Symmetry: C3
Subunit: 284 residues, 3 copies
């Protein structure tokens, strides 16, 4: 099978990104952040030195499937690395350098997972590599929204086909629409809290006003993260501390896609205005 990741080459470059002079995008503890960074880099470095990474075609049947799961865990760790890099204030170009490998690892995972399931079938369970109907949704949100925000949308079609197996809902369809050439979107919302609150924007919204998303940012991000952690956990809002975290990635990516004057949204500590700017400038 063709594998696209170049993780071993990327790691020494990433390891060096902790040395940045950029300001974080939100209030973080820098000591904690650096230790978190080192842990994720060490996990991915360990994975890169494993037999299952270096010789992924040596196993067959259930052994192949167990190796695929190890790759899937690595893909999650690369998503968390990307998230930590966003928190830290790494600029668009640096984030894109991570995103290309995060996307590649997810795609490679799905291909090895497919190949294992084929091997098992030909020897005589079924969910996609990333099943957005489940709690995994934030990784799919990250893959599509960060694709848009980092001007890497050309990876979205294979991601949607191979990783998600086209099991996308309304928001994911909007995020990937330009990339895939979608003419219609799903009517479903897999996780109505918070994403059902986008219903007004999708159905009644002109796309000529970012104001349509300002109440969404206030209520689903600012007011949510203002609650105690204990209270947050009692609500039904989906959270994704491994890929999505603090960031209104969906609203920010919609700004790139719609091209509107997003000034009203930049007041939000959860909006990624600098990445909106990056994606627009890079696109041109």
């Amino acid at each position: 099978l063709t594998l696209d990741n170049r993780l071993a080459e990327a790691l020494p470059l990433w390891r060096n990104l902790a040395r940045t002079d950029r300001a974080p995008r939100r209030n973080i503890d820098l000591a904690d952040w650096k230790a978190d960074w080192r842990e994720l880099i060490a996990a991915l470095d360990r994975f890169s030195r494993s037999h299952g990474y270096r010789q992924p075609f040596a196993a067959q049947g259930h052994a192949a499937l167990e190796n695929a799961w190890a790759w899937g865990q690595a893909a999650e760790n690369a998503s968390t690395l990307l998230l930590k890099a966003i928190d830290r204030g790494l600029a668009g170009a640096e984030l894109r350098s991570i995103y290309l490998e995060t996307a590649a690892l997810w795609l490679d995972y799905s291909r090895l997972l497919g190949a294992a399931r084929d091997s098992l079938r030909e020897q005589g369970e079924t969910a996609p590599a990333l099943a957005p109907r489940t709690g995994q949704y934030p990784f799919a949100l990250q893959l599509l929204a960060m694709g848009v925000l980092l001007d890497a949308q050309e990876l979205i079609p294979a991601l949607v086909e191979e990783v998600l197996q086209f099991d996308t809902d309304r928001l994911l369809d909007y995020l990937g629409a330009a990339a895939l050439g979608l003419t219609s979107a799903s009517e479903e919302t897999f996780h109505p809290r918070p994403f059902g609150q986008l219903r007004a924007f999708f159905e009644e919204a002109d796309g000529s006003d970012a104001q349509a998303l300002a109440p969404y940012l206030q209520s689903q991000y600012r007011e949510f993260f203002q609650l105690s952690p204990k209270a947050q956990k009692k609500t039904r809002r989906l959270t994704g501390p491994y890929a999505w975290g603090w960031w209104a990635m969906e609203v920010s990516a919609l700004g790139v896609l719609y091209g509107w004057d997003d000034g009203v949204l930049r007041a939000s500590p959860h909006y990624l205005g600098d990445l909106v700017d990056y994606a627009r400038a890079r696109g041109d």
Copy 2:
């Protein structure tokens, strides 16, 4: 089938414990401690994110067996996390929350191990903890910390499922109240140090009978160089038991004696004796 741990829920809360206002229970290097803490949390988090934790029933035959061993290592990690929290000075309530998951992970491990062995038969021998071996300290932690954290409701299940009833005299005395035991094993699985409890057990009460034991088996052992400690026959358990006279401390809870003579020992957990007594009411 029913797994009792709630590890994914617990981890974020265990992170915040490193932020405590408490003083350590013994002399520790706080930078080294925080680093050991982060390491164990990271390991447990990686386990909570693994396919074998998230889909524990997906594997069969030898694959199920290998997954059970990963759960086994996570249960050991939770025991070490509990030890590190005791060293750090975390109060009874916080320790109890860690213990509940530690015990749950040991039970879940034993149940998955058993299920794996059944799968292996359905296609087409050692218990989760074998106290006769060097794994005794984990069994000592599970029983003694169950007593010291007023969580004795776990002890019967742990004895039956994790230990498969392979207990010696000390383990029997620790579990006596919970099991409705009216007698105890005559055996001692690790005479060094536990054989030195004989004078106490064969007279049963009086905290005084435990004072020499704390002196000779704890203070005078840990005063030796690390190199000299290793040349002695004394059992050690750096992953679950460490510095702490958990057995003596648990006996203070079970017997209810005035433990003043024992509290002078830096190895005695007097604050947890008080916690367990107060919580037992």
Copy 3:
């Protein structure tokens, strides 16, 4: 099968080495070094507590092969721990005790690999444990060169036979020549950059023969940005070999010449040349 490593005994000693009074052998960041050291120690500790390490003969067939791979990664981790200890300035005696365990883990890895491959072919990849023709060469270089530099050449014949399965090139044959004899030393060079630049030395007594090699293949290479380094296509081995001209230093010990012109290099291990010489006698 018999296993030579004593990894569980060595670990507590190794974490102790961070407490050294020695100065580093090159400019390093001590905070970064300590975190790297803790990481390797943690990985080796986790491996030492794994079912695959504790019960290595339990798994059969493909499970035995997967277990062997885990031993292979532990061996690599022990090689990286050795390299970090060289950077840190740990003296010859301390490096020697790490090296013995490193070599033992590589040998144990190779034995388990062979046994798994035997289990499979009796149940109805062929590459050696370390294939020096590939990017694995730096681990082979470390094993033979540090064998010489730490006066532990008694390990060389086993390592060449079991770990390399005799797949050695000219430099490796030169490094093992005292231990194994120099009949036909290979004419091959597996990695022309940097090792083809030893051709003059091998074909044409005087340490000056290796002086340009150190400037050109070491001083001039490590002067470059990481980006410029990658463009040269020189083999590197950040997991075992790193900054160190281990080949040149070991040849110092083998040939016995006055290495004065070589100690001018920040990449030369003169204190270890001295150590192996003194210990050899």
